[PDB]
Amino acid sequence: MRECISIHVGQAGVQIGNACWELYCLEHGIQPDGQMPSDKTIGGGDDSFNTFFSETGAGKHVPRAVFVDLEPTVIDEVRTGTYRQLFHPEQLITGKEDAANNYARGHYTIGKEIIDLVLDRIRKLADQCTGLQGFLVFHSFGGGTGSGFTSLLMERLSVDYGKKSKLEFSIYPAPQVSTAVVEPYNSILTTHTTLEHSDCAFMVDNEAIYDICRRNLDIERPTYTNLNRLISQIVSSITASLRFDGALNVDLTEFQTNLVPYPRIHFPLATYAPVISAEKAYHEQLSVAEITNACFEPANQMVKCDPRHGKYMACCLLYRGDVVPKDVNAAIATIKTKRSIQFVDWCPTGFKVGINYQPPTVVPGGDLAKVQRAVCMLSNTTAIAEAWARLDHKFDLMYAKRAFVHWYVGEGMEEGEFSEAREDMAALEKDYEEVGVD
Amino acid sequence: MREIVHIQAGQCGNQIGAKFWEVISDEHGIDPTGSYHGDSDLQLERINVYYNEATGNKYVPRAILVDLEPGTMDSVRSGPFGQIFRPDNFVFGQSGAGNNWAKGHYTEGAELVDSVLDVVRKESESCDCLQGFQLTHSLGGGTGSGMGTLLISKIREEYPDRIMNTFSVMPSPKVSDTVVEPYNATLSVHQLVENTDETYCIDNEALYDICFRTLKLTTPTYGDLNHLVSATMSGVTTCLRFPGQLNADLRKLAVNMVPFPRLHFFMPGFAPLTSRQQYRALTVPELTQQMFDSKNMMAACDPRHGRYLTVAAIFRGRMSMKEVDEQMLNVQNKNSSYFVEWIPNNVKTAVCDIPPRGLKMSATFIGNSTAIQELFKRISEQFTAMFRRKAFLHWYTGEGMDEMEFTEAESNMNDLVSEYQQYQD
Amino acid sequence: MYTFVVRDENSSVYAEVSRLLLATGQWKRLRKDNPRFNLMLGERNRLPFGRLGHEPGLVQLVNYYRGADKLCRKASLVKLIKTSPELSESCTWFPESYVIYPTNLTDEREVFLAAYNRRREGREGNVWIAKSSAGAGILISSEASELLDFIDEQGQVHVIQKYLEKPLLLEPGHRKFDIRSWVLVDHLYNIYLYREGVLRTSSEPYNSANFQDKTCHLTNHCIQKEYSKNYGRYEEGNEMFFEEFNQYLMDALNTTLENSILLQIKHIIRSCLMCIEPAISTKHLHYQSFQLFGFDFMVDEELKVWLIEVNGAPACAQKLYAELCQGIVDVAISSVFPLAPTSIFIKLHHHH
Amino acid sequence: MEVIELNKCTSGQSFEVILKPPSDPSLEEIQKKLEAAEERRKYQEAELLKHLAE
Ligand SMILES: Nc1nc2c(ncn2[C@@H]2O[C@H](COP(=O)(O)OP(=O)(O)OP(=O)(O)O)[C@@H](O)[C@H]2O)c(=O)[nH]1
Ligand SMILES: Nc1ncnc2c1ncn2[C@@H]1O[C@H](COP(=O)(O)OP(=O)(O)CP(=O)(O)O)[C@@H](O)[C@H]1O
Ligand SMILES: Nc1nc2c(ncn2[C@@H]2O[C@H](COP(=O)(O)OP(=O)(O)O)[C@@H](O)[C@H]2O)c(=O)[nH]1
Ligand SMILES: [Ca+2]
Ligand SMILES: [Ca+2]
Ligand SMILES: [Ca+2]
Ligand SMILES: [Mg+2]
Ligand SMILES: [Mg+2]
Ligand SMILES: [Mg+2]
């Protein structure tokens, strides 16, 4: 057994992290007080769920997580919420005033004065790990803390934990729930400085989660709680292999080995199905082929884009529920004869399949209905570069006039860092095109 | 606990500031004695933003009342909510400023400024995390204009990294007290361009026209004009006084509204505005149509003459947030020629469940429009009509000023106009 | 009030469509860089499909199908036909073709020579043609050495296909011709065939003993009006329309345009568009697509129809701009953005 | 359509299907960047105070 430390930075990171650990507890049978009746080894043990939960002599199962926000209001909810008893005060870190949606403020001005305290709290959790694998970092692109402080933290983690893997769960900005006009600036600034420090990053476009909640869950105006509970199901599907007995993606290194043959191109597309409304009278349960086929529909992708017009470098199928290999292969065969699935010539045309018999757990009173089987497809497609193109365009529009730049320069950042970050993105888009187009 | 320190200076500044604390004190359930008597927890959620909490569960506004003569502040103290202000927070002289910017900024005001800063310093020393300051004042007089901008300069010196916000009443010949208002206004605008992060331009002519044409008030008074300002100040500060994610604090608001440091002068708007057919329900399309109509704007500048750099909209009341997004997108998608295309998604919309007093719902509009240059053009032309003959300058040269300082203020404001024009094309 | 942007100033078709849209008073044109649009008349090359369908509250539609170039490229079409089981290599309505890369750069050189040497030995007609999409650059010859040598002198991908030695000739004149069919595919992937076609005729007598002079062999409108001397002799602008052509088929061959030619044309259009539907359909996509296509057919003396190529950004006959452009607005644009017959198209039903 | 590396356990199983075969900055450098930006902030505030002192 090897431990995984989760880090949640900013409002998005914290609130998403809160939804995941709620789900993790319900999946492993852990109560809000940290008690786990099924755990027969009191105060220890190297079971699969121990990669995310430590144990005290009193039998409490404590998440291996750190929450960081430059403002206290969001993390205060965790301190007084349902799961206030899971975490101890050392794990929850808050400042006094936030980064004001200003990358430079979170990275330089405020980041410099709190980075050592955060590393100190992380070191404590690392000291409890007999074989630390690495970190899972949750954050947004558009926030000043989520963008600016995360990149500073990722740089230091590479320094203090050189041989450790680092995975990201990043929230791509969407105006329908967007807070700031400068979020394209922050998104590109943080992608530039984080790119060399992240081994694998799962981007979630808020626009995609927003429309899934309206289309599939009939939520007219989704809230952050609606978005986060859906996001935590997908996150749970991606991390299940680290928390349960299995043989696929058993450690953080396997995510890179299986999903990222080229380092810079480390943004796999996630696709999830089925998402069924809980208010429905009663749905007709879908089969293995129908949920698998749904993994090739843009409407359930975490990032809206057209994978028919890119190329695949890897593809993982993660099933939960009543699934046997026979039905998986039968569905894949039928999808190869109906769908446009083009792999790069220097990669094998194949699918790594993982099946966990326990169907997805649903939060009591949540929005999602119980389903007998579900799947999450992770595919490294050049089509996700459409999201970089969209973002880089908005950046170009504002930066051409230097709009809002004085806010960044005023926090000590040099203007040249803008163009340095933009040129790196232009190189990223070019890499995708060299790999996907003919 | 992100506290804001409020300052009101001069006649106009204290009369409008008085009504403001009257309106929001009613919204938060605070009575004239400082005791809370609401029925919703949302009222107290962000109450510490504007109110200090004293003994006995009393809420005292974090406000500093400043003037160079006692008259107007004597009225406030005897006014409706006069007892709610901290007695030590009244700082005033006896000389007056005689509508003379030089007196408020250099001579009379200088003698009193240090004592005002002692109170500001006292209020800030009790703030857990001071956001910044908001000042209410006029620009056509002596105290609010001249000493007001002096206060801002010395506040920015002591708190260089805090946000400085103002509600500035711009003079108009149609609602004028003295012929020197364009002099005082041009000298203040130069100060504001340098030392404020956000200035809400309230033009007294726009307020007059609204009271007359739209509200059907035959003979508008300053009191009528101040009703509109109170309501607008309540609308724009809703983001700060209640739970919300968008423009939640002063710095985040500035980051989203101010793409260039000098272009931080906003046109505010309010809806509805009804003449006493006052009980009719107002649909969301109507709120949106009015909110973007020039007749509902208080800068007396036609938005169709320029372009919006950024827009902040706040809807108040129990309504369909879905229908809000639709109508907002419809306005941008039906008039996208009036929004600059080099700032994507520059129109942000916020909702609040608590509506103003006596309204099922309302909408407040905050626009950073290049059309505001028309306001500075009017002032500049009125300034130059007198300055070319050096008319009425002796009032200022008698207080130590030189003509050069006027020439510089003039050029600086014309530069601001040229800056707004280059971004409109 | 709908909004649209123009990003192809050289499009005669959509220049008229934009003109008609404004004439309705219910459409408003925006600057070519304004993202808040309902409809995009996009550029030909490098159309940013990735930026479409991400504007909250705007249903967005574009006049090009992403991925349709597979059908509208000389080399792509050959590769699509030989590799798609729906079309198969034994496809009987497409001339035997091969993809030949210049030697300065898969490649079907040897596969072509084997089929060529087979015809040379069997006494059969061995006249091939070379062409490419990078042309205004065509060569017709019976010797394989000339064809391949002509490609090596160039630097782009070429295609060598069989030259229809027995084309149907119009009388009087004894002259070649081709048929241009306009096909509109809407967002629902309905296939509408414009009722009006045009025959681009050669005003020169077809001569099968001299492929060096390419005036009586290439029916392009620019070649006839530039290098031909009988331009506009038999029909105005070398453009015979379906009414005249049909009457000719009845007086001379005792048959109709519908039975002898149009059935094959409708079958070819369906087969091509249905084949690529799974790859280009926008049925479940965040944006919608439609596109006007120009099919070019050949007719031999047996009244057998062959496909020559498909044009993705075609022009229209001067006499048919009004009718067709109005048809594009009705079934392609207004079907998605309704305004406040006897259709001019022939719906080609099919299974989605 | 070959299935390889089939592993089975009480809680699930995994396998691989092959449809077709194929064809940093140091801690010192970070401190300098942070201190350099903090130095540019100090300079900009000093100029502002110098301006307000005039
Ligand atoms: N899916 C999801 N997105 C969120 C959530 N909270 C914020 N966001 C998105 O994150 C972006 C804003 O960044 P925040 O995380 O709120 O900012 P921050 O990291 O706290 O940094 P500060 O500027 O200091 O507040 C916007 O695009 C929001 O839509 C959340 O709970 N769930
Ligand atoms: N295999 C073949 N057999 C007989 N004629 C052929 C032929 N291939 C091409 N042609 C002749 O060439 C002309 C079409 O050329 P092609 O369409 O390939 O070039 P192009 O694309 O530049 C013209 P356009 O796209 O405008 O129709 C036709 O008029 C036809 O007569
Ligand atoms: N809206 C409004 N404007 C006022 C009021 N009182 C004065 N003004 C305007 O403010 C200017 C006069 O400044 P004033 O505040 O009286 O001078 P001060 O006391 O020296 O600051 C003129 O342009 C007046 O039209 C008021 O109560 N409401
Ligand atoms: Ca245990
Ligand atoms: Ca590393
Ligand atoms: Ca004195
Ligand atoms: Mg925050
Ligand atoms: Mg007065
Ligand atoms: Mg062509």
Side-chain angles (χ1 to χ4, degrees), chain A, chain B residues 1-245 248-425, chain C, chain D:
Chain A
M1 185 276 304
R2 304 185 65 198
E3 303 83 359
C4 288
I5 297 180
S6 295
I7 304 180
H8 317 274
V9 186
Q11 169 174 138
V14 166
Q15 294 185 163
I16 291 170
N18 226 21
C20 296
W21 289 100
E22 182 195 31
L23 181 54
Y24 291 164
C25 291
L26 297 170
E27 292 187 352
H28 296 290
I30 302 175
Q31 302 175 6
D33 60 329
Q35 296 296 325
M36 184 179 183
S38 59
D39 185 2
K40 305 308 174 183
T41 41
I42 304 300
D46 52 357
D47 297 311
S48 272
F49 69 95
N50 284 124
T51 64
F52 278 63
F53 294 83
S54 59
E55 306 182 30
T56 72
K60 175 183 291 186
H61 302 59
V62 181
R64 308 181 188 271
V66 181
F67 295 75
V68 189
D69 201 1
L70 303 182
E71 161 227 8
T73 57
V74 175
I75 285 179
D76 281 334
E77 303 280 2
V78 182
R79 296 190 182 106
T80 62
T82 298
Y83 290 93
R84 59 189 175 277
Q85 293 186 122
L86 282 185
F87 319 88
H88 45 266
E90 284 83 12
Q91 307 173 260
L92 310 184
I93 313 179
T94 58
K96 287 256 177 172
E97 61 181 352
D98 60 39
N101 298 324
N102 184 338
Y103 173 95
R105 193 166 171 89
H107 186 90
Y108 300 92
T109 302
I110 298 184
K112 173 184 181 292
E113 296 299 347
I114 201 187
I115 181 62
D116 299 306
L117 166 68
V118 173
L119 291 184
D120 189 77
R121 298 293 165 84
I122 293 175
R123 174 65 58 190
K124 284 179 176 175
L125 288 185
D127 288 359
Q128 287 186 104
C129 299
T130 60
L132 178 62
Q133 301 186 16
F135 308 88
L136 311 181
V137 187
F138 302 79
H139 68 105
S140 62
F141 277 179
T145 300
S147 71
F149 182 74
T150 296
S151 68
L152 176 59
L153 178 64
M154 295 287 280
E155 286 182 310
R156 293 287 295 272
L157 287 180
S158 299
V159 177
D160 296 17
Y161 307 85
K163 305 303 175 59
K164 277 64 174 64
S165 296
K166 298 195 289 297
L167 279 61
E168 293 185 72
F169 289 96
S170 311
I171 303 303
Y172 184 102
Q176 284 177 314
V177 290
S178 176
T179 303
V181 180
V182 301
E183 294 201 37
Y185 284 171
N186 298 336
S187 298
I188 284 177
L189 288 172
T190 193
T191 299
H192 168 54
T193 58
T194 305
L195 201 50
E196 276 303 61
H197 302 279
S198 185
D199 303 289
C200 183
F202 306 102
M203 280 195 304
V204 179
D205 190 339
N206 262 349
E207 171 194 86
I209 301 293
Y210 192 81
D211 284 334
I212 291 173
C213 290
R214 295 198 297 170
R215 188 193 319 111
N216 301 30
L217 300 172
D218 298 340
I219 310 298
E220 303 218 53
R221 213 308 182 175
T223 64
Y224 279 143
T225 301
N226 300 119
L227 305 175
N228 294 344
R229 284 212 175 106
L230 175 58
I231 290 175
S232 47
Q233 292 294 333
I234 284 70
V235 174
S236 172
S237 294
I238 300 171
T239 62
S241 56
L242 306 167
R243 305 180 279 113
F244 295 96
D245 190 2
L248 171 68
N249 299 344
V250 55
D251 62 16
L252 300 175
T253 299
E254 200 155 344
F255 282 84
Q256 172 273 306
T257 291
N258 291 338
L259 299 174
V260 187
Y262 269 61
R264 288 175 59 91
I265 315 300
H266 60 242
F267 299 88
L269 174 67
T271 308
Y272 192 85
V275 175
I276 303 300
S277 172
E279 300 300 334
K280 243 181 180 297
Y282 230 72
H283 196 68
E284 329 78 13
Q285 286 307 303
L286 298 184
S287 66
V288 173
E290 292 173 325
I291 70 175
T292 299
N293 189 22
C295 291
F296 297 88
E297 286 294 338
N300 24 251
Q301 295 166 2
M302 297 302 95
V303 181
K304 284 177 184 180
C305 59
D306 195 338
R308 301 172 300 181
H309 296 106
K311 287 194 169 195
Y312 289 86
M313 292 159 278
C315 195
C316 268
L317 294 165
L318 302 177
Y319 294 86
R320 309 180 72 169
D322 182 51
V323 183
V324 295
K326 171 184 54 182
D327 293 333
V328 179
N329 301 326
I332 292 179
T334 300
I335 295 175
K336 276 300 303 176
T337 64
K338 276 177 149 55
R339 298 279 186 170
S340 301
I341 306 175
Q342 272 278 304
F343 270 75
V344 301
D345 300 326
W346 46 272
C347 289
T349 304
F351 304 92
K352 283 188 175 68
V353 176
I355 298 172
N356 192 291
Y357 297 145
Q358 177 180 310
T361 301
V362 294
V363 177
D367 299 305
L368 304 195
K370 188 71 174 187
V371 300
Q372 271 304 353
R373 62 194 55 85
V375 63
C376 171
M377 189 175 75
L378 305 180
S379 59
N380 196 334
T381 308
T382 61
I384 205 175
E386 303 177 22
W388 300 129
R390 306 159 52 205
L391 210 50
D392 287 327
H393 183 62
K394 293 178 171 178
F395 183 107
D396 291 343
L397 288 172
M398 289 187 300
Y399 192 67
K401 313 283 178 299
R402 300 304 189 266
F404 303 102
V405 170
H406 66 281
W407 288 107
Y408 294 75
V409 177
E411 297 290 350
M413 197 177 88
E414 309 194 84
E415 199 178 65
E417 180 165 355
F418 272 93
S419 51
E420 196 191 48
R422 179 61 179 92
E423 301 179 0
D424 190 16
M425 294 298 309
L428 185 59
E429 281 189 84
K430 183 170 180 177
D431 296 330
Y432 276 104
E433 193 175 17
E434 298 185 23
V435 179
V437 197
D438 301 0
Chain B
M1 322 174 191
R2 39 187 58 167
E3 295 78 31
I4 292 174
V5 176
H6 167 95
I7 307 168
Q8 49 190 60
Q11 179 167 34
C12 182
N14 277 279
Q15 288 180 173
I16 284 189
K19 302 299 298 191
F20 168 73
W21 286 103
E22 179 174 353
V23 173
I24 68 168
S25 292
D26 170 79
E27 293 189 1
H28 290 275
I30 315 298
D31 67 356
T33 55
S35 296
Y36 172 85
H37 283 277
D39 64 329
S40 176
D41 303 323
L42 296 70
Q43 300 175 275
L44 300 183
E45 185 85 32
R46 310 250 275 188
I47 197 67
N48 57 12
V49 174
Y50 284 86
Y51 297 76
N52 284 305
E53 199 165 339
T55 313
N57 210 21
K58 285 284 188 175
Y59 295 102
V60 188
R62 191 176 302 98
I64 308 176
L65 298 73
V66 185
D67 205 346
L68 282 175
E69 57 188 19
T72 296
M73 287 174 48
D74 275 352
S75 283
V76 173
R77 192 182 301 102
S78 296
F81 286 68
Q83 308 295 352
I84 200 189
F85 300 106
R86 197 181 193 272
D88 288 328
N89 284 29
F90 292 79
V91 187
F92 54 94
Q94 297 287 330
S95 64
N99 295 283
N100 186 321
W101 192 91
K103 289 191 174 194
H105 199 87
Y106 290 118
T107 59
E108 310 295 336
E111 196 175 7
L112 185 75
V113 75
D114 280 359
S115 63
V116 168
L117 295 175
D118 289 337
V119 179
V120 172
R121 186 171 310 103
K122 177 277 173 189
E123 288 293 359
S124 296
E125 291 176 340
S126 73
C127 290
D128 184 22
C129 190
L130 171 70
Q131 288 194 43
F133 311 83
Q134 74 176 32
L135 167 81
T136 61
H137 67 149
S138 69
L139 309 187
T143 303
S145 197
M147 186 181 180
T149 50
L150 181 64
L151 283 176
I152 287 167
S153 193
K154 290 183 187 302
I155 284 182
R156 195 187 172 187
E157 185 174 19
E158 188 163 16
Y159 310 86
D161 58 333
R162 304 296 85 181
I163 292 295
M164 177 69 63
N165 224 322
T166 78
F167 298 83
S168 300
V169 178
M170 313 285 176
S172 170
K174 310 314 181 64
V175 191
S176 163
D177 298 338
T178 67
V179 298
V180 292
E181 287 164 1
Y183 282 154
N184 301 328
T186 296
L187 296 162
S188 286
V189 170
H190 182 33
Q191 302 300 312
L192 296 177
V193 161
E194 277 191 356
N195 299 318
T196 72
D197 301 303
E198 301 168 283
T199 289
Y200 298 93
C201 303
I202 295 97
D203 184 299
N204 259 1
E205 187 172 15
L207 299 180
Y208 186 90
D209 294 330
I210 294 173
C211 287
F212 189 93
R213 310 182 194 186
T214 303
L215 297 183
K216 300 315 177 189
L217 298 177
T218 302
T219 306
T221 67
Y222 276 130
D224 295 306
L225 275 53
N226 296 338
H227 170 72
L228 298 178
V229 182
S230 310
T232 299
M233 300 186 52
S234 175
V236 309
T237 60
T238 297
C239 286
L240 318 172
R241 298 185 287 106
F242 295 99
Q245 242 71 11
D249 60 74
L250 290 179
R251 179 170 293 109
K252 276 191 176 174
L253 175 66
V255 169
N256 288 332
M257 292 294 294
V258 185
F260 306 101
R262 285 180 296 289
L263 310 189
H264 60 267
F265 298 94
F266 305 156
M267 301 196 326
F270 185 87
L273 303 168
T274 307
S275 62
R276 294 181 169 91
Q277 293 290 345
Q278 50 177 134
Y279 310 95
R280 174 195 179 186
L282 209 59
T283 71
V284 173
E286 295 177 331
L287 266 187
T288 307
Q289 297 185 275
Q290 299 184 216
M291 180 183 45
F292 278 102
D293 188 359
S294 62
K295 302 200 304 298
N296 289 66
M297 307 216 181
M298 287 150 195
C301 293
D302 199 351
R304 306 179 76 98
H305 291 182
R307 317 189 78 192
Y308 288 117
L309 302 173
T310 58
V311 175
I314 306 81
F315 293 75
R316 302 189 62 174
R318 304 174 68 255
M319 69 191 68
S320 169
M321 182 168 301
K322 160 186 168 62
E323 200 183 41
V324 180
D325 295 330
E326 296 181 356
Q327 292 303 320
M328 282 305 297
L329 293 170
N330 175 271
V331 174
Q332 311 170 73
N333 297 328
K334 290 185 74 71
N335 318 281
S336 62
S337 59
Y338 297 106
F339 302 83
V340 295
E341 74 287 354
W342 41 273
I343 300 184
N345 314 107
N346 59 347
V347 184
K348 293 306 176 185
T349 307
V351 178
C352 175
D353 295 306
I354 298 179
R357 179 58 86 107
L359 289 187
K360 290 291 188 63
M361 52 183 56
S362 64
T364 302
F365 172 88
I366 306 170
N368 190 344
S369 164
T370 68
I372 195 68
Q373 67 167 300
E374 293 180 340
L375 185 162
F376 303 114
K377 283 187 182 180
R378 292 194 298 269
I379 304 294
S380 185
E381 295 183 346
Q382 298 163 12
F383 175 99
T384 292
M386 303 185 298
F387 191 67
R388 66 180 175 183
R389 304 293 286 265
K390 300 180 177 180
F392 306 104
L393 282 186
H394 72 95
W395 300 128
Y396 302 84
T397 62
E399 301 299 319
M401 289 184 74
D402 185 75
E403 295 178 1
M404 186 77 69
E405 183 160 347
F406 287 73
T407 296
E408 300 173 347
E410 172 188 51
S411 293
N412 298 317
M413 192 158 68
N414 289 341
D415 287 350
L416 185 67
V417 173
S418 293
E419 192 174 0
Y420 272 120
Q421 180 66 27
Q422 62 172 127
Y423 292 114
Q424 175 174 307
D425 310 327
Chain C
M1 183 67 62
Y2 304 102
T3 60
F4 70 100
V5 299
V6 173
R7 297 170 62 97
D8 189 354
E9 308 290 344
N10 303 324
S11 179
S12 54
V13 172
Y14 296 97
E16 174 65 354
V17 176
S18 179
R19 197 280 296 187
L20 295 178
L21 297 180
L22 297 174
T24 68
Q26 308 180 29
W27 281 85
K28 185 172 179 298
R29 174 174 178 175
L30 313 172
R31 302 193 209 84
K32 62 200 308 173
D33 301 317
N34 189 329
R36 293 196 180 285
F37 58 82
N38 290 116
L39 169 65
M40 165 179 295
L41 310 182
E43 53 270 85
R44 304 186 194 92
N45 309 117
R46 307 195 64 86
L47 195 163
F49 294 98
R51 303 210 306 258
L52 301 169
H54 302 278
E55 277 301 344
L58 290 184
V59 183
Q60 290 184 319
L61 177 71
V62 62
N63 66 338
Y64 280 96
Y65 263 98
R66 189 183 189 186
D69 52 319
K70 259 59 181 179
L71 197 65
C72 309
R73 242 75 181 187
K74 301 297 196 308
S76 302
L77 182 58
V78 175
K79 180 185 178 182
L80 170 67
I81 290 177
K82 289 185 174 182
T83 59
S84 306
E86 304 78 21
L87 313 181
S88 72
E89 187 187 45
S90 60
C91 167
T92 61
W93 47 258
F94 187 74
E96 183 176 357
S97 306
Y98 298 95
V99 183
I100 299 297
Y101 289 81
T103 60
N104 50 278
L105 284 58
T106 56
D107 188 71
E108 289 178 319
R109 273 183 175 271
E110 291 187 345
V111 185
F112 159 81
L113 301 178
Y116 176 92
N117 290 329
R118 174 178 294 179
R119 287 185 168 270
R120 160 174 294 189
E121 183 185 16
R123 290 302 97 98
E124 296 181 345
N126 220 9
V127 172
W128 300 73
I129 181 181
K131 48 183 178 177
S132 63
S133 296
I138 285 72
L139 176 62
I140 310 176
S141 183
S142 59
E143 302 297 348
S145 59
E146 298 180 358
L147 297 182
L148 301 178
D149 288 336
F150 171 77
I151 300 180
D152 303 338
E153 300 164 344
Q154 299 298 5
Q156 57 282 350
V157 181
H158 280 78
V159 294
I160 297 179
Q161 69 172 181
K162 185 69 187 63
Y163 186 83
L164 302 178
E165 301 186 16
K166 299 181 178 183
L168 177 63
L169 300 185
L170 304 176
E171 301 297 343
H174 200 72
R175 49 206 180 94
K176 197 173 182 177
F177 75 91
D178 79 326
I179 298 174
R180 158 59 63 87
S181 303
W182 293 280
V183 173
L184 177 62
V185 177
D186 66 10
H187 61 295
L188 304 177
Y189 218 93
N190 292 328
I191 303 175
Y192 299 108
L193 170 59
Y194 185 23
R195 80 163 81 106
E196 299 292 343
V198 300
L199 282 66
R200 293 173 286 184
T201 62
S202 173
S203 61
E204 300 299 357
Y206 179 85
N207 188 88
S208 56
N210 174 19
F211 308 107
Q212 178 184 358
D213 184 354
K214 304 173 298 180
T215 299
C216 82
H217 294 273
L218 289 63
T219 62
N220 295 322
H221 190 281
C222 75
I223 297 181
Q224 296 292 331
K225 193 174 183 180
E226 274 290 357
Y227 304 102
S228 181
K229 304 183 180 183
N230 281 328
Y231 177 84
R233 177 186 181 183
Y234 308 87
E235 41 277 349
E236 187 172 0
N238 293 12
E239 293 181 352
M240 175 180 299
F241 293 86
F242 276 7
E243 186 176 353
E244 177 184 0
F245 180 52
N246 180 80
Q247 186 68 217
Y248 171 85
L249 287 174
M250 297 187 304
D251 302 339
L253 284 299
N254 187 22
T255 186
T256 69
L257 177 63
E258 167 69 31
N259 291 4
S260 63
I261 297 177
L262 213 59
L263 279 180
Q264 295 170 81
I265 290 187
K266 288 181 293 186
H267 168 67
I268 296 175
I269 296 173
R270 284 184 56 195
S271 296
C272 290
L273 290 170
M274 288 179 56
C275 175
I276 64 177
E277 178 173 2
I280 70 172
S281 166
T282 65
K283 182 180 179 182
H284 308 285
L285 208 59
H286 42 291
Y287 70 89
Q288 295 299 327
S289 296
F290 69 92
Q291 190 175 352
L292 181 67
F293 293 96
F295 284 74
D296 300 342
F297 302 96
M298 274 286 300
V299 183
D300 65 6
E301 62 181 24
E302 299 294 280
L303 289 180
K304 179 184 176 181
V305 173
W306 306 74
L307 181 71
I308 299 304
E309 76 152 2
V310 187
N311 295 270
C316 189
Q318 169 57 0
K319 182 196 67 175
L320 305 173
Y321 270 109
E323 195 177 17
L324 173 63
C325 289
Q326 174 57 29
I328 297 180
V329 176
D330 293 1
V331 312
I333 298 181
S334 295
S335 68
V336 185
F337 309 96
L339 300 165
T342 302
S343 176
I344 72 173
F345 298 96
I346 312 171
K347 181 178 180 179
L348 309 184
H349 293 89
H350 69 285
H351 302 179
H352 311 273
Chain D
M1 193 66 178
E2 180 187 18
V3 169
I4 71 179
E5 297 187 349
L6 170 63
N7 292 104
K8 299 167 61 187
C9 72
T10 291
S11 60
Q13 56 183 307
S14 60
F15 62 95
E16 185 180 16
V17 55
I18 302 182
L19 304 183
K20 186 199 303 178
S23 300
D24 287 334
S26 66
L27 183 57
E28 169 192 13
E29 299 170 339
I30 298 173
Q31 279 293 310
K32 294 176 184 173
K33 294 179 186 173
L34 294 178
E35 290 179 333
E38 178 182 37
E39 214 53 15
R40 284 182 295 273
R41 280 193 315 271
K42 296 183 179 181
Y43 177 85
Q44 304 170 26
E45 176 168 306
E47 291 303 306
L48 170 56
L49 298 184
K50 184 213 314 296
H51 185 82
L52 290 176
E54 299 162 347

